[PDB]
Symmetry: C4
Subunit: 121 residues, 4 copies
């Protein structure tokens, strides 16, 4: 169900690193679209740092008049959720859009990945 | 459910600006595929004007023998609907096609966005 | 439901022009991926001829060792079905693939369109 | 349902060639993204060899520090399942991703196909 995805967004968006991390199965992975290949894999014990570093990135974006807006997850059965994301300037300009994929197993996240429109570095 | 999406198409297609606007949550956004970026964001109080201006555009299209045809929304659970759109000439020629995304929250539209085949200016 | 889509494939695949045509609403359209634009629109009374001409095309393909294989439609609620198509040579070579979109209204087809991988003329 | 897809992954991943093969209808096809065209068709009696040869390929990949990870299938009704695949290096680098399509009929696989991001030879 969507509860673990909701919990993840709320806790990770406030810096409750420990709650956010615990949304992931011990074998779960969070794939970010950076690095040599199509992405970089983060395991559960890499994910707390990742959250912290993405929060710091978000603050720089905000200071520039840009921020991401995440919609409530759309569930496809119990084990998959799609989250629409839109990155917008305060002037009303979409600068990026994408979909966060969540694959769940047993109420935990086993895969978080993103598909984005603009391949930002 | 699809009722608010249906209400939106019927009212906005006839110029009932006030009913159409009220289909959107106060925090909702309607993204149009124009502007510097991947689109331009319209908030609820920008949406009435937008409807009026798109109706005027539609009349110019019709006078040229071109018009858009929208299918009934296909629901994915309660909170997402997809609307197929086809732009056709009176001679039977598809000139554009796309999908209108609706994300709902609490019976209101929180995101209307479009994906189109031809990136028309 | 899928019955009208199944009926359409069975009847149109055997040349029962009248049954196939009657699967379409009077306002339905069948879009083929040929012509000046992204496709060409066929109304209900253009569709019988279209079926005949596509059957004749299919026979030429078969004589060349190529044929299309259609899977059973995958339903998304009552009013949308997706049909996977694969075009294969008798030597085991996929030469095209795509998805037939069916949008239904009231048990009739209101839109049949195709998305294909190879933009064959 | 997903049972036949699960059975197929478990048995084919261990070399139980006979169980894996019997997951396919007698008319089923497994399409691999190699060959002259958009893929190559394997019938039921070609599929055992295919499994063996893909296992041997997998062992070479593993010896290079690369392996594929398959998620549990996401069902769309009874007759379609999507399986997310990610190919990763042991250093945490996604090198390929895709989706395995399964179309079922009567509890058997009638079509297995893949869509991949990187068109690897
Ligand atoms: C993992 C890739 C990140 C990108 C996507 O996933 C979709 C996209 O294109 O934009 C994203 C970047 C973005 O704009 C924001 C606001 C990231 C913030 C983070 O958001 C949380 C809630 C986790 C989800 O990322 C905690 C952080 C504050
Ligand atoms: C917001 C982008 C507009 C495009 C799409 O969304 C999908 C696409 O490619 O074509 C569209 C343009 C089009 O052809 C029409 C008929 C617009 C009319 C408007 O339609 C209403 C019902 C609202 C929905 O747009 C009120 C207006 C009369
Ligand atoms: C309308 C576009 C046609 C293409 C698609 O729709 C998907 C695709 O890429 O290949 C198709 C062409 C094809 O290979 C066949 C076998 C057409 C035969 C016709 O099939 C029937 C059953 C109607 C459905 O087309 C009656 C005809 C004998
Ligand atoms: C049929 C195309 C193969 C590719 C995909 O399907 C998705 C993708 O991009 O990567 C795949 C290649 C891959 O990395 C692995 C691990 C193949 C192993 C095989 O996996 C089993 C379980 C069958 C499913 O393939 C038995 C074999 C050991």
């Amino acid at each position: 169900s969507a509860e673990v995805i909701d919990r993840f967004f709320k806790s990770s968006g406030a810096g409750d690193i420990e709650t956010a991390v615990e949304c992931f199965a011990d074998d779960g992975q969070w794939i970010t679209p950076d690095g040599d290949g199509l992405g970089t894999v983060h395991t559960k014990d890499q994910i707390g740092d990742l959250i912290t570093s993405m929060n710091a990135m978000r603050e720089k974006m905000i200071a520039s008049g840009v921020d991401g807006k995440f919609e409530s997850p759309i569930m496809f059965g119990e084990n998959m959720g799609l989250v629409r994301a839109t990155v917008e300037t305060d002037d009303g300009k979409v600068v990026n859009r994408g979909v966060d994929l969540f694959i769940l197993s047993d109420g935990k996240i086993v895969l978080k990945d993103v598909y984005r429109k603009v391949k930002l570095a």
